[model samples]
Target chain A: MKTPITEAIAAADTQGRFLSNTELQAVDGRFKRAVASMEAARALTNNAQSLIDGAAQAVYQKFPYTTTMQGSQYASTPEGKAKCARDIGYYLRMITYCLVAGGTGPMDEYLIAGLSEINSTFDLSPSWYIEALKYIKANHGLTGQAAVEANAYIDYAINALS
Target chain B: MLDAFAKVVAQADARGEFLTNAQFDALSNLVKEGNKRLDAVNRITSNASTIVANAARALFAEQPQLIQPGGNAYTNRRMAACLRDMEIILRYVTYAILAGDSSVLDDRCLNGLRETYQALGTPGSSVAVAIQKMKDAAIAIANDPNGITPGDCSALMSEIAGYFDRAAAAVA
Candidate 1:
């Protein structure tokens, strides 16, 4: 059986084809149906992911933000955009790997290098990051000092796994 | 008489919130602008369709082999690009219609818009499907054009209006 993410990618690909074909008027109602099906499939995929992530977030508190955190105003700034792009490139690579491999692996060093490069180049606001870290500490059962240590561990773990 | 009619409609839309004369004028001007924009977009689409048909005919006439299945060459690309452009314009118009008057967000309109979007995203979608979705949305808007009711229609309108407002803000 195909994974939900794989199915979603397939649906998205089909939708893209439909969009390209229908725009050219090569097909008829078939395009509309195909798109509707793709949308429905996407909704299902998102819902499934949300359920899984929601459960993880509930238990771990920081899992969601750890993987999904995004800055609101960074895209508005020049340096911020560059840093964001670099960071996102690494993030997306990890995500793509997970999608393709169906599991996370040991690639922490690379992931960390990517993070360090971004941190060195840009002023990433620490407020939300700190909040996320605190949540991880509370939920992951780490003491203050342990949490700091664990944060480093996570940073390294992500890099190793990627 | 026209002013009185306009006042009544404006008040109805505002649910009895008093509007100054200037506000009423602004609302009237907005409605006029919306109508003009819709007309212009419709004309553009009509012209575009004619152009596509003419181009297709000319290509097929020149190279009869192009008319063969799997031999249309660039015809498919041209048609796809034109239709996609038209669909995008249609989406914008639907959004504009909803924005110009909050009342156009009835259940029918919402459903129609959703259907249209889905159709646009589908593989092998045809011009008929696109046109049908537009007509469905238009019919919905026509049903409660002024939104003089107090029910799901208003709620749905508010929800859709929020989406369009966000889209407008994103583009702006």
Candidate 2:
């Protein structure tokens, strides 16, 4: 899970010592947040399909012209919905993995950046996907610290794509 | 490659001392996770060529400027050398994984990599992108679920990612 806390602990281990008091407190705080993230991860993996569908619906709802326009990438058709679902599903999956890992990994950055790069190459709007992630963050069915952690992951993805 | 115990012994011997309790615990943890280290190295080594090729192709696809005229990878010869450099970097990263340390990678691979890239007129940022792409590929391969028993290898994966990130940072 490559968080700074874990990195610090590993650095201390390499030096054959325990973490300092300040470091220990930081780890303690991370442990609490990690517990919440675990719960958030479980919620996401269990309800991924529903959450993704809902978020995709919210995206089309927010941007009605996307489905109504003739040349829209996500038109109101089966193929369009499938494509939309797939794109949103991809982001949800990455966000879930990031949550499960308890922090964002390089894989998250690589995959998200690759998508943005492709979008840029094709002259597609990156904002649509960014908006999709916003809906995902809004409807991800987490609360308290779990919601906070979940939102962080979604924000991380959004920031990458942005 | 020295395990934690051997690493401590080497350091202690240089100072004419004995291993400490903290060192013992760290070594014990390393022993418990030895299989993970081995599996990580094996996975990366097995897919080294795939990783290098995939990452390089993806890099060129994402940044086509690098393959255009007057760009860094402008010719087949330069492209071949680019792939070779990626392969060399991935090889050193695999060595670091096996050793459970980055010293070997730092000392041998990345020490002069930035200067070399600068001298060759290669964009360090582009090289960093390639490394990041390889990091993603290698981790996905190492984390694949079908052929091996399932276990939490997060820490090991993180450590492996750290090696690639280190290489990327060195050149970037």
Candidate 3:
């Protein structure tokens, strides 16, 4: 079985590459603008996941032979604090942007996507991500999956627009 | 707007669930500085408008196109509105600072700034309309193609400088 650290590293690498590709493809016109915006939304989610993974990696690196919760404290230093603050702030701001500009539907989808990716790496229970998504959908009255897929469609249209 | 603000506030609050006190403090301080900067900008602009209006009557002349007949007054009016909005922002910032909470930097303020900036960039948009109206009236008296008088520009520059000075002072 792969260790959580190994899993986190793989997830981070995957997420980072995905975000970079999305950013690159976003530079195409008006249709591309929608794609770019959606890409930006997805990128933020991926970036947040990457940061979490990075935090996990730092923890693992410091305690090389450990995989316990205590290993997480490796990130308890001042530097770690700064990293969390900066990364969390960016993630929250991006979510806010998507909600305000694209509506709650997109926001829910982004959160759902992020939670799913995070779960894949960390084994977080479904309740964690599902609860948040449910709240978002109920409050916003928008279908989260539809919004997310719409964004994907827009992303696909970007190349055609180019 | 409420939802956006709530989400941000929730996120900020959630950070405390995971972050140490010192970490939270540092982030809160950064937010305080941002708030102070916004307030300083408003104060400087308010004061500069008064000085500019007194020195240049033609620039502040009651042109309907620029100030609207009974509907608006251009420069002074717009400056007032900008200051008002900034004050609202400052209020939130102040609350955040005093609360010493990171939640204050949430989506509400971020979205507010984005919306404000967008309006400012568009010509004849609220901010644009106000700025253009003032400039058009002022240009009627200026000889330069730029249409902005040296004194008027100087006053504007001074106001901007004052805002920066206040912002720097706040962080210090």
Fnat per model, in the order shown = 0.00, 0.00, 0.00
Point out the higher-scoring one by DockQ: 1 or 3. Answer: 3
DockQ of each: 0.01, 0.01, 0.02
**After superposing candidate 3, which stretches have Cα over 4 Å from the reference?**
A1-109, A112-125, A128-162, B1-36, B42-57, B60-172
Candidate 1's displacement at residue A75, Å, is 29
What would the DockQ be for model 1?
Answer: 0.01
Docking class of 3: incorrect
Looking at model 3 chain B, report the run of 10 residues with the lowest lDDT sum: B93-102
Query: Per-candidate TM vs. native?
Result: 0.21, 0.50, 0.21
Q: What is the TM-score ranking, best to worst?
A: 2, 1, 3
The list of candidate 1 runs beyond 4 A from truth reads A1-14, A17-114, A120-135, A139-162, B1-84, B90-153, B158-172
Deviation of model 1 at B140, angstroms: 1.3
Candidate 2's DockQ: 0.01
Q: Chain B TM-score of model 3, please?
A: 0.29
User: Model 2's lDDT to the true fold?
Assistant: 0.79
Q: TM-score of model 3 relative to the true fold? A: 0.21
State how far residue A124 of model 2 sits from its true place (Å): 31
